[PDB]
Scaffold this active site. Structure first.
Site, PDB file in Angstrom:
ATOM      1  N   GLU A  69      93.610 -68.498  42.874  1.00  0.00           N
ATOM      2  CA  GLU A  69      93.240 -68.408  41.465  1.00  0.00           C
ATOM      3  C   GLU A  69      92.331 -67.209  41.209  1.00  0.00           C
ATOM      4  OE1 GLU A  69      94.677 -70.168  39.100  1.00  0.00           O
ATOM      5  OE2 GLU A  69      95.831 -71.094  40.720  1.00  0.00           O
TER       6      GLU A  69
ATOM      7  N   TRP B 207     129.038 -76.626  43.563  1.00  0.00           N
ATOM      8  CA  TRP B 207     127.645 -76.812  43.954  1.00  0.00           C
ATOM      9  C   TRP B 207     127.528 -77.227  45.415  1.00  0.00           C
ATOM     10  CZ3 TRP B 207     122.569 -76.332  43.071  1.00  0.00           C
ATOM     11  CH2 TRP B 207     121.697 -77.215  43.720  1.00  0.00           C
TER      12      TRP B 207
ATOM     13  N   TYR C 167     111.041 -67.095  42.008  1.00  0.00           N
ATOM     14  CA  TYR C 167     110.592 -67.483  43.336  1.00  0.00           C
ATOM     15  C   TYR C 167     111.329 -66.743  44.442  1.00  0.00           C
ATOM     16  CZ  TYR C 167     108.543 -70.568  46.850  1.00  0.00           C
ATOM     17  OH  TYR C 167     107.833 -71.072  47.915  1.00  0.00           O
TER      18      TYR C 167
ATOM     19  N   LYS D  26     126.519 -74.960  49.270  1.00  0.00           N
ATOM     20  CA  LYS D  26     125.469 -75.538  50.103  1.00  0.00           C
ATOM     21  C   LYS D  26     125.952 -75.763  51.528  1.00  0.00           C
ATOM     22  CE  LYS D  26     121.485 -78.414  49.039  1.00  0.00           C
ATOM     23  NZ  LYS D  26     120.921 -79.373  48.048  1.00  0.00           N
TER      24      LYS D  26
ATOM     25  N   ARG E  94     114.269 -78.281  49.642  1.00  0.00           N
ATOM     26  CA  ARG E  94     113.671 -77.008  49.255  1.00  0.00           C
ATOM     27  C   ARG E  94     112.541 -76.616  50.199  1.00  0.00           C
ATOM     28  NH1 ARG E  94     110.714 -75.820  43.364  1.00  0.00           N
ATOM     29  NH2 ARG E  94     110.065 -73.677  43.845  1.00  0.00           N
TER      30      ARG E  94
ATOM     31  N   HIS F 174      94.743 -80.125  37.381  1.00  0.00           N
ATOM     32  CA  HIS F 174      95.714 -79.076  37.663  1.00  0.00           C
ATOM     33  C   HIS F 174      95.008 -77.725  37.696  1.00  0.00           C
ATOM     34  CE1 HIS F 174      99.042 -76.218  36.949  1.00  0.00           C
ATOM     35  NE2 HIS F 174      99.786 -77.114  37.573  1.00  0.00           N
ATOM     36  N   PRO F 175      95.093 -76.987  38.804  1.00  0.00           N
ATOM     37  CA  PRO F 175      94.380 -75.702  38.901  1.00  0.00           C
ATOM     38  C   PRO F 175      94.985 -74.673  37.958  1.00  0.00           C
ATOM     39  CG  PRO F 175      95.040 -76.547  41.073  1.00  0.00           C
ATOM     40  CD  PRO F 175      95.801 -77.321  40.048  1.00  0.00           C
TER      41      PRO F 175
ATOM     42  N   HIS G 285     112.396 -78.294  37.431  1.00  0.00           N
ATOM     43  CA  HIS G 285     112.616 -76.909  37.029  1.00  0.00           C
ATOM     44  C   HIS G 285     113.881 -76.776  36.190  1.00  0.00           C
ATOM     45  CE1 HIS G 285     111.482 -72.642  37.806  1.00  0.00           C
ATOM     46  NE2 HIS G 285     112.753 -72.437  37.503  1.00  0.00           N
TER      47      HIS G 285
ATOM     48  N   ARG H 123     120.058 -89.956  42.531  1.00  0.00           N
ATOM     49  CA  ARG H 123     121.186 -89.202  42.000  1.00  0.00           C
ATOM     50  C   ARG H 123     122.175 -90.065  41.224  1.00  0.00           C
ATOM     51  NH1 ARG H 123     120.932 -84.162  42.714  1.00  0.00           N
ATOM     52  NH2 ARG H 123     120.273 -83.105  44.634  1.00  0.00           N
TER      53      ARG H 123
HETATM   54 ZN   LIG Z   1      99.040 -68.498  41.292  1.00  0.00          ZN
END
Ligand SMILES: [Zn+2]
Lengths: 595, 50
Positions: free
Chosen positions: A357, A459, A497, A463, A255, A327-328, A487, A151
């Site tokens: 998938e 912020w 999400y 929290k 997270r 990466h799938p 993100h 940070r």
């Molecule tokens: Zn998916």
């Protein structure tokens, strides 16, 4: 002659050419991602540029038709989906500034090391060599130091970029008939035109606030239980009544609490039965794994896969001469072409990922009958919701006992059920408040309620009250905490999400009450059920041609978010949490600070 | 891409049984003369299969 016929002709002409032009780009991208070399990268540019130029030209030419005299909903929806000009509403110089600011922020996030008070010849970057301390290390003075260094090093220069990024995004949103960038993001949930199913842009916020209202006590009990379990390792550092520290969690940002499973376990003596060490004794392969996945998928009432699907799909790692980004992905190439690109291993993790998938593969082909503009979801949450329920159903212990993976001796026990319920809860319950808090912070930042001189004042306090996380060290008005995420570093929507998890639970319940199931919601499956599985196939034929409210009302019976399958899912878990947390203090106060 | 085979996409009216037309006239969707150029509201009636 009038507007309807001209608009229909223009849509037909656009769909005639777009279906052919986007296929080349998709095929080139698949070839690059499967065969990354020095020639595919430069081949990306011309295909991407041609497709983008054609799309922008068509969007510009899709304006002479007024959106008032169109009475049919299909053509109106197509024209509206073809009206979104995106970032083209900005000026050329302003667009260049936005592009270079985004590129600078992305390349700053890509780089970045840390400085150690000890021997400084060691450099730790975003490589997995740094998150190991935050996930696996169980001592002190390392995870906190790593968090502070992360940070402090890259947390300083991301502030001036973000200051200009916010105002540029606000200007771009205002240029597209919006109030702010958060309003632009919330516009994806806005659907206009229905008979009792109309949805408003602002109501989404209202549909969020009360949702978090129904997960207060379960999350508070989980917080108290994890704090009590952490007390043993850190008796002199974790406050029994105070909030949990920002670091020392199972994630860099707290997270995901997945890494906290070994430290927080009801019974460590339970074997946690797994059949990963079972396919070697009798012979299994990745092709057999995919065969089992497709056999289970066609056992519910879904179509059989195409012959070319097994020919154009990579299911095992290449030997030599080719490189894969690892990466799938589930590519919809176009013109009835579907592929899966991923490396398959002998593990139930790869089994679950393959089923996830495969859910996407079933979903994508389910809307092949739309004029290239409705071949999406009504909202952005439907795509990842389809693969979650299939993965959950196939992971049930009853499902594994139908394929010979489990001997017919062990049926069920309560302790393993509680352990599994806790380990599943510490992937969603521990991330929902964080997602809600981040989304709210971003919403007030983009609205303008949070001034630029008080960012590092709103912020943290939320929290302390919403997430129940307290900072270990003070942070002044010079750092930029929320920009450190991948993100956040780019224009990614994070509210997706928050809603998707609800879609994970809303569908499954409706898929289990139609299967003559009266037991627990976390022990039901859709295997060997033609009817329980027909509803999803029927609903997976509209996409964005109809409002998401109607599709939801015709699949689960709820017109809006009525999210209470989670409490029925973790019901024994909540009961056990209430029983265990009796001689304690459930909750937290926003006054304590460790230092 | 096999761009040899073609087909008709826009026509003023339907085809009579056992009828065949090979006219390459520009189909006008708007209310203005095409003047022989492919601009607005005017597209070629023949497309390819690829
Ligand atoms: Zn998916």
């Amino acid at each position: 002659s009038l507007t309807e016929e001209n608009a229909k002709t223009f849509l037909n002409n656009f769909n005639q050419e777009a279906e052919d032009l986007s296929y080349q780009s998709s095929l080139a991208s698949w070839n690059y991602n499967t065969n990354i070399t020095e020639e595919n990268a430069q081949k990306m540019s011309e295909a991407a540029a041609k497709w983008s130029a054609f799309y922008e030209e068509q969007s510009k030419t899709a304006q002479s038709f007024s959106l008032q005299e169109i009475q049919t909903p299909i053509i109106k929806r197509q024209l509206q989906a073809l009206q979104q000009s995106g970032s083209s509403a900005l000026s050329a110089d302003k667009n260049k500034q936005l592009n270079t600011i985004l590129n600078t922020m992305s390349t700053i996030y890509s780089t970045g090391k840390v400085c150690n008070p000890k021997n400084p010849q060691e450099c730790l970057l975003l490589e997995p060599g740094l998150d190991e301390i935050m996930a696996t290390s169980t001592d002190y003075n390392s995870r906190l130091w790593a968090w502070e260094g992360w940070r402090a090093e890259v947390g300083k220069q991301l502030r001036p970029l973000y200051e200009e990024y916010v105002v540029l995004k606000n200007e771009m949103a205002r240029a597209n008939n919006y109030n702010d960038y958060g309003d632009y993001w919330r516009g994806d949930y806005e659907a206009e035109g229905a008979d009792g199913y109309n949805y408003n842009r602002n109501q989404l916020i209202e549909d969020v606030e009360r949702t978090f209202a129904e997960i207060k006590p379960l999350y508070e009990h989980l917080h108290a239980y994890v704090r009590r379990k952490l007390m043993d390792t850190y008796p002199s550092y974790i406050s029994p009544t105070g909030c949990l520290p920002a670091h020392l969690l199972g994630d860099m940002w707290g997270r995901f609490w997945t890494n906290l499973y070994p430290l927080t376990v009801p019974f460590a003596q339970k074997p946690n039965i797994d059949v990963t060490d079972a396919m070697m004794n009798q012979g299994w392969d990745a092709e057999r794994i995919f065969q089992e996945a497709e056999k289970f998928f066609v056992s519910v009432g879904l179509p059989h896969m195409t012959q070319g699907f097994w020919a154009n799909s990579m299911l095992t790692e290449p030997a030599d001469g080719r490189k894969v980004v690892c990466h799938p992905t589930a590519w919809d190439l176009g013109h009835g072409d579907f592929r899966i690109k991923m490396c398959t291993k002998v593990t139930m993790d790869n089994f679950l990922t393959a089923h996830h998938e495969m859910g996407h593969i079933q979903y994508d082909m389910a809307y092949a009958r739309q004029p290239f503009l409705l071949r999406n979801g009504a909202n952005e949450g439907f795509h990842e919701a389809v693969g979650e329920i299939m993965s959950l159903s196939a992971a049930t212990p009853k499902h594994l006992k139908s394929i010979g993976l489990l001997p017919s001796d062990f049926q069920e026990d309560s302790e393993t059920e509680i352990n599994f319920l806790l380990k599943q809860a510490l992937t969603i319950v521990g991330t929902l408040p964080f997602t809600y808090m981040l989304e709210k912070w971003r919403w007030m930042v983009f609205r303008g309620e949070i001034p630029k001189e008080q960012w590092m004042k709103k912020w943290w306090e939320m929290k302390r009250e919403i997430v129940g996380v307290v900072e270990p060290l003070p942070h002044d008005e010079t750092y930029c905490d929320p920009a450190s995420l991948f993100h956040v570093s780019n224009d990614y929507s994070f509210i997706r999400y928050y809603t998707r998890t609800i879609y994970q639970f809303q569908f499954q319940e409706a898929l289990c009450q139609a299967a003559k199931y009266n037991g627990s919601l976390h022990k039901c499956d859709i295997s060997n059920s033609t009817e329980a599985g027909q509803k999803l196939l029927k609903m997976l034929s509209l996409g964005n041609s109809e409002p998401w409210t109607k599709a939801l009302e015709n699949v689960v019976g709820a017109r809006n978010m009525d999210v209470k399958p989670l409490l029925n899912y973790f019901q024994p878990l909540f009961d056990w949490l209430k029983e265990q947390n009796r001689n304690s203090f459930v909750g937290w106060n926003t006054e304590w600070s460790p230092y | 891409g096999n761009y040899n085979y073609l087909y008709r996409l826009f026509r003023k009216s339907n085809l009579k049984p056992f009828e065949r037309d090979i006219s390459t006239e520009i189909y006008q969707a708007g209310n203005k003369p095409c003047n022989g150029v492919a601009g607005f509201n005017c597209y070629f009636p023949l497309r390819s299969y690829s």
